[PDB]
Paper text:
In order to better understand how bacterial virulence factors such as M4 engage SIgA, we designed an M4 expression construct encoding the ectodomain (residues 1–314) and combined the resulting protein with purified, recombinant human SIgA1 to create an SIgA-M4 complex. Using this complex, we determined the SIgA-M4 cryo-EM structure to an average resolution of 3.1 Å (FSC = 0.143). The final structure included a single M4 dimer bound to one SIgA; M4 residues 45–73, which include the entire known IgA-binding domain, were built whereas the positions of residues more distal from the binding site were poorly resolved or disordered, likely due to the inherent flexibility of the M4 dimer’s extended, coiled-coil structure. A subset of residues between P46-K68 in both helices contact SIgA, with one (helix-a) forming the majority of contacts with the IgA heavy chain and the other (helix-b) using equivalent residues to contact solvent and a smaller interface with IgA. The M4 interface includes 11 residues on the Cα3 domain of both heavy chain-A (HC-A) and heavy chain-B (HC-B), with a total buried surface area of 1000 Å2. Participating IgA residues are predominantly located along one β-strand in HC-A (F443, T444, Q445, T447), forming hydrogen bonds with M4 helix-a residues R49 and E54. HC-A E389 and R346 also reach out to interact with M4 helix-a residues Q47 and D57, respectively, and HC-A D449 forms a salt bridge with R59 on helix-b of M4. The M4 interface with IgA HC-B includes only residues S356, E357 and A360, which form hydrogen bonds with Q66 of helix-b and R61, K68 of helix-a, respectively. In the case of M4, the inclusion of S356, E357, A360 and R346 in the M4 binding interface, together with its extended coiled-coiled topology, enforce the surprising 1M4:1SIgA stoichiometry because the steric accessibility of these four residues and neighboring residues differs between FcAB and FcCD. In FcCD, S356, E357, A360 and R346 remain solvent accessible, but JC loop residues 24–32 bind the adjacent region, blocking the path occupied by M4 (helix-b residues 69–72) and therefore occluding binding.
Immunoglobulin (Ig) A functions as monomeric IgA in the serum and Secretory (S) IgA in mucosal secretions. Host IgA Fc receptors (FcαRs), including human FcαR1/CD89, mediate IgA effector functions; however, human pathogen Streptococcus pyogenes has evolved surface-protein virulence factors, including M4, that also engage the CD89-binding site on IgA. SIgA is polymeric and is typically composed of two mIgA that assemble with one joining-chain (JC) to form dimeric (d) IgA, which is bound by the polymeric Ig-receptor (pIgR) ectodomain, called secretory component (SC). Here we report cryo-EM structures of M4-SIgA and CD89-SIgA complexes, which unexpectedly reveal different SIgA-binding stoichiometry for M4 and CD89.
Residue numbers in the entry:
A (entry chain b), B (entry chain a): 45 to 73
C (entry chain A): 242 to 465
D (entry chain B), F (entry chain C): 242 to 472
E (entry chain D): 242 to 464
G (entry chain E): 2 to 490, 502 to 546
H (entry chain J): 5 to 94, 97 to 137
Write the structure that this text describes.
Amino acid sequence: DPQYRALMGENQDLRKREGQYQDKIEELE
Amino acid sequence: DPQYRALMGENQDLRKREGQYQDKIEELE
Amino acid sequence: CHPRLSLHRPALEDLLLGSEANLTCTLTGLRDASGVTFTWTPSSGKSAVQGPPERDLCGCYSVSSVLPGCAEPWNHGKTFTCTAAYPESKTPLTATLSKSGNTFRPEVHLLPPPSEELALNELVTLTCLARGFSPKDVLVRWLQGSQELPREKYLTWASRQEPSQGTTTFAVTSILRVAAEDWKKGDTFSCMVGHEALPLAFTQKTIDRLAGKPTHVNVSVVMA
Amino acid sequence: CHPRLSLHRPALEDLLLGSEANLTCTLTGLRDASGVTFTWTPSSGKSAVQGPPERDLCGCYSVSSVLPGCAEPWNHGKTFTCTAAYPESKTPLTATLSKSGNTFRPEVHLLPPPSEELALNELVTLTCLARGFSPKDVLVRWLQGSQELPREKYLTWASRQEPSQGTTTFAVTSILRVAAEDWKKGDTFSCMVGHEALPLAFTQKTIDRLAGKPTHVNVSVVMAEVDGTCY
Amino acid sequence: CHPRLSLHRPALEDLLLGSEANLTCTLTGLRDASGVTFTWTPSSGKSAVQGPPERDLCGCYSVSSVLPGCAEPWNHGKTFTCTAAYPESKTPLTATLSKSGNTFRPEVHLLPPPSEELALNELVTLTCLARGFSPKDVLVRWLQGSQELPREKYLTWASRQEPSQGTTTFAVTSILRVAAEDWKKGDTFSCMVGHEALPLAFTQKTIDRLAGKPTHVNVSVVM
Amino acid sequence: CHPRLSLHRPALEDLLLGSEANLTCTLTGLRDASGVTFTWTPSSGKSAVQGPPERDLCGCYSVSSVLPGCAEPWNHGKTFTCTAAYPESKTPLTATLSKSGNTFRPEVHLLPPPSEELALNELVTLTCLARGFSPKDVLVRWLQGSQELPREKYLTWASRQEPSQGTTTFAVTSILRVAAEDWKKGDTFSCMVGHEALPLAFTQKTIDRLAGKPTHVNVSVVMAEVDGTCY
Amino acid sequence: SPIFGPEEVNSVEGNSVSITCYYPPTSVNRHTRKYWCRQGARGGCITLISSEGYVSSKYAGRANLTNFPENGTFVVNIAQLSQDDSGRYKCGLGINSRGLSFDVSLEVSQGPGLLNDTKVYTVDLGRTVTINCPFKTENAQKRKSLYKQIGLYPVLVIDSSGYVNPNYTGRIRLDIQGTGQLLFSVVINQLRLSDAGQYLCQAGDDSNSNKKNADLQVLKPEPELVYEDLRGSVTFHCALGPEVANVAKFLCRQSSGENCDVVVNTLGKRAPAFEGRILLNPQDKDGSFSVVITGLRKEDAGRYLCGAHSDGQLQEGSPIQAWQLFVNEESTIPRSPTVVKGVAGGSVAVLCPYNRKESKSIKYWCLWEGAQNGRCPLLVDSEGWVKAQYEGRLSLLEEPGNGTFTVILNQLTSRDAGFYWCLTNGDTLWRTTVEIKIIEGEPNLKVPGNVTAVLGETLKVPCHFPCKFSSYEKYWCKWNNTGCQALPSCDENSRLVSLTLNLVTRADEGWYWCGVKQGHFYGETAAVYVAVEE
Amino acid sequence: RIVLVDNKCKCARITSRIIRSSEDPNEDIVERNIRIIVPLNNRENISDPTSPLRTRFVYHLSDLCKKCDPTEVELDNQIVTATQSNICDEATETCYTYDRNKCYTAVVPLVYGGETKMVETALTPDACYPD
Ligand SMILES: *[C@@H]1O[C@H](CO)[C@@H](O[C@@H]2O[C@H](CO)[C@@H](O)[C@H](O)[C@H]2NC(C)=O)[C@H](O)[C@H]1NC(C)=O
Ligand SMILES: *[C@@H]1O[C@H](CO)[C@@H](O[C@@H]2O[C@H](CO)[C@@H](O)[C@H](O)[C@H]2NC(C)=O)[C@H](O)[C@H]1NC(C)=O
Ligand SMILES: *[C@@H]1O[C@H](CO)[C@@H](O[C@@H]2O[C@H](CO)[C@@H](O)[C@H](O)[C@H]2NC(C)=O)[C@H](O)[C@H]1NC(C)=O
Ligand SMILES: *[C@@H]1O[C@H](CO)[C@@H](O[C@@H]2O[C@H](CO)[C@@H](O)[C@H](O)[C@H]2NC(C)=O)[C@H](O)[C@H]1NC(C)=O
Ligand SMILES: *[C@@H]1O[C@H](CO)[C@@H](O)[C@H](O)[C@H]1NC(C)=O
Ligand SMILES: *[C@@H]1O[C@H](CO)[C@@H](O)[C@H](O)[C@H]1NC(C)=O
Ligand SMILES: *[C@@H]1O[C@H](CO)[C@@H](O)[C@H](O)[C@H]1NC(C)=O
Ligand SMILES: *[C@@H]1O[C@H](CO)[C@@H](O)[C@H](O)[C@H]1NC(C)=O
Ligand SMILES: *[C@@H]1O[C@H](CO)[C@@H](O)[C@H](O)[C@H]1NC(C)=O
Ligand SMILES: *[C@@H]1O[C@H](CO)[C@@H](O)[C@H](O)[C@H]1NC(C)=O
Ligand SMILES: *[C@@H]1O[C@H](CO)[C@@H](O)[C@H](O)[C@H]1NC(C)=O
């Protein structure tokens, strides 16, 4: 229920998505 | 609490970063 | 020694995580005439408070005046002018201070530990770099997971000026050393930067193990 | 004001990349004039030079002296003392110094650019972090390929003391910003750290696009013959 | 020169590969006229005409006799003694001819190239060793697959007497250098030894790459 | 029969395993008697002994003479010019011998016993092959453990020049027979080859059952991503 | 693998511990990183302290690490131990993941306290102990008994009437001294490992029962660590007390069978493996002797025990002292010929190495003599003394001079075969042993027999050499106690390097040497005695 | 186990063992063990800018086992010095790993004021100090 846990979860999801996009950009080159 | 605001700012920055990643993948094709 | 009046802007730490704001106008190089009248043209809100002279330059009695409560006018864009007089001459001294524009946000990078550090089973180093911010004031702090850390655990350098050609910008760095067991377990770490130009005045970056590109090898043994 | 005497160690750059080991004795708190006399414990080729006075803070004079040609004793472990006597004095001032002990060799780490900087493809930052050495003095330089870049190209910070997990130590960081095309073409950049504790007074760490992480390497091992009368 | 008489034996190559194997009974050194009379005990009915009578090295004359009409069919062990007469004093001279037994079969070993030669990919040496035969008369030939190799493509040493405990035995060696690419390809190389004591008169040995199967190399990687 | 003169270089056994570089000069074709004379140009060891006039095949005469000397001048590259004065003619004929040039070093190989000879458990054959040397002189010796076997225990052939692969080269072989219970035990056998063209004049190769063909090999590959230093 | 240390460490709570670990003194080893870490079930050693300035949180204030590059050692000091400090630790160098380390085991046991009802007695193995058990004055003439609490039920070991348990017969006594003494004592000699345990005294079977429980523990000797190099030497100092100053001493090596294989005794014994490379010195007044072993091999590593017993072997009831030995095998000692063969009548030159850092020492040559406990008398020294029976055929030269000196011995005979030792005065003392043999043959250099001289007449002496001594330097020298020196006397082709004496006086008489040398290195020599008559 | 060879130029260790049986030849076995350590962070030539990574490791058993040093042999009555290999080309081998006991240095040009100097850098700092 606390805000900080939900914010941490959203941050982790965005970090994983950023890593996936990072992989995808490099694989194109 | 400054820490919560900092976490929100980091979330916004990561969202912008992944948006720019999407824009970068679009042009390369 | 030699008369001189200087104005100091409010400190960033109080402006960001504090409530009260200091506004300092100081005179140095008198060694006498303690009855110096520090008069501020924007005499609004609170009242000016004087302070006892202090030994400065080993030959002067530096006297400073503070105008607290001016955080809101300072942020709004009100220019502060400090006026004082000395008995040496009949010409009063006036100084001005105001906020500057063209503010750029910083770019923060958190770097994982070098691969040659994990082989010693000792602490590991994490570096946080803030770069490119125009105003020369910034504050950097750290978190392990959710619990903050005391200031006696990490080192930070002063915000120097970087060698560019386009515009003037500054950089700062800090390092935090953490237990190898904490790093390998899966605990995350973060570095937070606070600066004027940010809309929320606070951002941070987070690092944890097994994050990023995969690093597995593919070996082919032929044996002829 | 209050007279004082001090000694300034030779600059690190001069010692490492020079031949004049000048040690300077500085005197402050001059009253009205400069009729001081300086001397040192050794005198074999001690071409002491005083020079003209200067201007001090708040208004004051301060005349210092220098002593060159002392590199050999400095490295061998000698101790240098400068004693001065000014006319308005009753007891000469003294100062002493010697090479620092308990020195720790620095640990140098060259961190590849952050992964987010290599996608905007404008400029990339290489970070050189030297960590864990006892004396404060240190130097940082850079090389692209084999030719050093001009010192007006990067930003180096002052040496500072870090938190204690044992004995006392220091740290320094430097950064270089380089074109992304150069990085992605296959150029190699080296960071050179110069410190008295290191064996040959200098060390270097190199990095390129592939070093620092496997990230899907392809390794081939042949092992041609394995039953072949190994003698 | 000093007059003398000698008796030879058919060439091993002629014996095992030729149908014109003819013995020889020669008179080395002649200082008289055509007073040569040679007789051979066998009377099968062939021709025993005299060979080419000519001179020899350093002012010597010699007359030779052969049996061109016979292919030397003396497997049963005909003594084939030679009797010669000359116009000299009344002391006719003969020759010692017999078929000595004690026939031991050769043992042939074909050895692969040293591994050092295989690490440079230039040329590889194959060695043939024939050992343990009493009749010191053997011939070595080389084959690549089925095609034979000319005698100018390999080296062969003379047949020597190897040390032994009581029984006498002879040994001989040979080597052949072949292109490393062909050896790695997998072409088979054979050494053939021809000798009298053999039943078929020829023993063949073969070698090629991957001749050693039972080797059990094992591979495993860590981290 | 006919006059002829020849100079023979010293044997390799005396030259290498020693320093006696005796020289021999021989003439064939003596007419009626031994009224002949010899002359070398380095007349240092004037005591050149002349042997009896040995006969030849079926009425021929030959005369050989010996000039002693150490191997130092010969290795230095001197020249010798034996000349005969047989009475059958009034014109002497000369012969010249000097150290051979354009040399090469042998490539020694020591081969393990063949498989078919090991199942019978009677005796094993070790083969030594020296190859690719231009001069025709070479020495082959065998050793068991660290002791030299007597010369009557192994068989050595002679040097036959091999088919022309461009230039002129030679080859030699030898074999040794060893008790099978000794090879299986784990003793070591060495073949030593001596040539004039080798840097140290000798080269040995040692083999035993451990340095032979193994019946099982384990290969383990370790990947060290931290650093390469081979502790 | 080259690292060493104490295999097991024992301590109780509250005390400090010190652990010394050894490495080869190579410069990389001196200047690299030394660490002390603790392993676990995860397989990774977690560094607890290092030499570069790191001190773990758990070890802050207590532990510290000191490196002694000259020694080749580094010491870890720990303080305020506890039951949690028990486990498996490692020394090491460089990186943790590599194998350059050594395993140690630490065990911490609970300390005593509040147990005043029971006493404690600690004695060394095979040493006498005494136990005083008071009895109440109410019991004047009552049986005094000692009971050993063994197994479920206690038994009797000694009474006051002369009944002694078989396990204690012949070495346990009971005393009740006079002079109005109302306390009795029990004295046990030649303590054994099984004699330790819980004892209880009793004064009669009356209701008084003035008992007093006591505890006894016999201590084992902690091994002393020794770290030596290959083909070097080791010295054992056996320093047992004067109480056994007149008993046969022995040195043995414990093996897998829990049974000493005697290495040396004092009754005239010796193993066949240590022929020519072992020495047992006489003992001093205190009762200590030394044992020297040279030419250390790969198999000289293990536990050694020196003791004093009547039969000269390891039996219970004899005090013992323990050493542990490590042979480095990463040695910097130069390799030299262990076997040197000379031909009867020829000569021999021996190169003896020493430490380059002690070039101003004194050098000695000795001949090992068996047929005793072991000995090594002197033959020649580097100062001008030579034996009376070796005059004219032995010399020492410091000619190479880069950590090596030559010894020349000619006129060989079949009696000269044996073992010879090279010694020096330095602190780092390698002892090098060379075995000289004799075979049949002829000398290379040829000189005439004994030469006579007529007073006031010129004399000439030849010295023929073979064809292989033409690229050398030929010399004639005059032998003297301080060494011979080349003369300015001639040469020729491969023969006849000659000595000339214009005028002969009585001083010219003596021994001369004709020899060859390659500038710095010496070779064969031949000795001729030049006399003078009238 | 008898260590046939150890090699720091390429970090390869080869050992051999023999395990016989009471009965028959076939039961007897000879085993050879090969241990290879493959670095992944040093260059083709050991100098700073070279071939961003080395990814081709080639091991020849004949090259690993070579012994390029002389020896003393007593043949009949004298001692002779003999070589021990045919592959002893005369220091150019392409080593794959740094020897722990040897130190490797580079030379770099640095500008000091209005001049230029050639400074010496230590790639392996522990391997050799000025002693
Ligand atoms: C080389 O020639 C010399 C000269 O004749 C030989 O030396 C002679 O050897 C014989 C046999 O050993 C001795 O009886 C003579 O006394 C020697 N004479 C001299 C002057 O030394 C020598 O043996 C020959 N070398 C070889 C290898 O045959
Ligand atoms: C080698 O280690 C020994 C043992 O620690 C050192 O000898 C002791 O050193 C301490 C401190 O220097 C002294 O207090 C002791 O008196 C020394 N002797 C003993 C018996 O402990 C020795 O100094 C070390 N090597 C060197 C070169 O210092
Ligand atoms: C040559 O004369 C010397 C001088 O007497 C002899 O050397 C001594 O011989 C005696 C008899 O054995 C020994 O007791 C002495 O120790 C020897 N040395 C000295 C200095 O007297 C020598 O034996 C004689 N013969 C030879 C071949 O040298
Ligand atoms: C590996 O790199 C080193 C770098 O020093 C090369 O050695 C230098 O090569 C240059 C170019 O010929 C010479 O000018 C230097 O004098 C050499 N330095 C030294 C210390 O010898 C080395 O040749 C390279 N190796 C290979 C196989 O390319
Ligand atoms: C100003 O600074 C002082 C200390 O420097 C601090 O105590 C005070 O809270 C600050 N603010 C005001 C309004 O004085
Ligand atoms: C040291 O002093 C000498 C003497 O004036 C001067 O020439 C030299 O430049 C000085 N070097 C320094 C300050 O590094
Ligand atoms: C490289 O490694 C991959 C394994 O992921 C393999 O499929 C490929 O064949 C290898 N070679 C090349 C040229 O990619
Ligand atoms: C290390 O600790 C021991 C005791 O713990 C102390 O005696 C010694 O002086 C200490 N050494 C250093 C260098 O701190
Ligand atoms: C005596 O020693 C033997 C040795 O095995 C043991 O079994 C027995 O229990 C001992 N008895 C006593 C009374 O100690
Ligand atoms: C040999 O001696 C010379 C001179 O005494 C010296 O320069 C050299 O370093 C020495 N060699 C060795 C290996 O110590
Ligand atoms: C030679 O020896 C004699 C005594 O034998 C001695 O008096 C003399 O000093 C010595 N001289 C030398 C140079 O050794």
